[PDB]
Amino acid sequence: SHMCDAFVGTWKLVSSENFDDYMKEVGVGFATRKVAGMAKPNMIISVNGDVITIKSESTFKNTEISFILGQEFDEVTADDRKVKSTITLDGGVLVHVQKWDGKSTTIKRKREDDKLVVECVMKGVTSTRVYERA
Ligand SMILES: O=c1cc(O)cc(CCc2cccc3ccccc23)o1
C-alpha cells in the first residue's frame, strides 16, 4: 500500500523534447508520428489495492493499462504495437519495460517537484515529457 501515492491523480502534458526522434527509433511511421506528436494527453493514475491503473485520454489514442508491480502483462500501445510489459518500482521511479519483435523500450515515470516526468528510452535515444497536475 501507499506505494504510488505521489503518482495518483490527473496529469496533463505540458512539454516534450525529442519525442519524434524517440518514435522514429521505436519504428513508428510518419503519419502516426505526426498525429501522435501533436497530442497533449491527460494521464490519469489510480491505485486500488495492488492494482495500478494508468489511463491516457488523448486526441490521438485513448489507452488504459492495469497491472501489478513485477507481473508481466499484454499491452497494445497507442501506436499499435503488441508488447509484453513489466512495470516495477526502483527507488521510487516507476520503470516500464516493453518487449516486442525482439526489441525493448523503457519508460520511466518519476515525481520531480510538482511535475510528473516521463523519460522514454529506445537504444541511445531519450525523450523527456513533462506533466503537471490537471
Ligand atoms: O506514459 C507516457 C506518457 C508519454 O507522454 C509518453 C509515453 C510513451 C508511450 C506512448 C504514449 C502515447 C503515444 C505514443 C506514440 C508512440 C510511441 C509511444 C507512445 O508514455
From Swiss-Prot:
What Pfam families would the database entry show?
Lipocalin
**Phosphoserine occurs at which residues?**
15
Its Gene Ontology molecular function terms? fatty acid binding; hormone receptor binding; long-chain fatty acid binding; long-chain fatty acid transmembrane transporter activity
Q: At which residues is N-acetylcysteine found?
A: 4
* In-chain residues carrying the UniProt-annotated modification Phosphotyrosine: 22
Output one GO BP term. cellular response to tumor necrosis factor
Q: Where are the transmembrane segments?
A: none
The subcellular localization recorded is: Cytoplasm; Nucleus
Could you confirm whether the keyword Transport appears in this record?
A: yes
Question: Which domain of life, per UniProt?
Answer: Eukaryota
Q: What is the effect of changing residue 25 to D?
A: In a breast cancer sample; somatic mutation
Name the keywords, alphabetized.
Acetylation, Cytoplasm, Lipid-binding, Nucleus, Phosphoprotein, Transport
Indicate whether Zinc-finger appears among the record's keywords: no
| InterPro entries in the cross-refs | Calycin, Fatty_acid-bd, ILBP, Lipocln_cytosolic_FA-bd_dom
UniProt xrefs under Gene3D superfamilies:
2.40.128.20
Binding positions (a fatty acid) = 129-131
Identify the GO cellular component terms for this protein: cytoplasm; cytosol; extracellular exosome; lipid droplet; nucleus
Q: What does this protein do?
A: Lipid transport protein in adipocytes. Binds both long chain fatty acids and retinoic acid. Delivers long-chain fatty acids and retinoic acid to their cognate receptors in the nucleus.
The family note in this entry says: Belongs to the calycin superfamily. Fatty-acid binding protein (FABP) family.
- What do we know about how this protein assembles, alone or with others? Monomer. Homodimer. Interacts with PPARG.
Q: What is this protein called?
A: Fatty acid-binding protein, adipocyte
Q: Which organism is it from?
A: Homo sapiens (Human)
The top of its lineage is: Eukaryota, Metazoa, Chordata, Craniata, Vertebrata
Q: Which gene encodes it?
A: FABP4
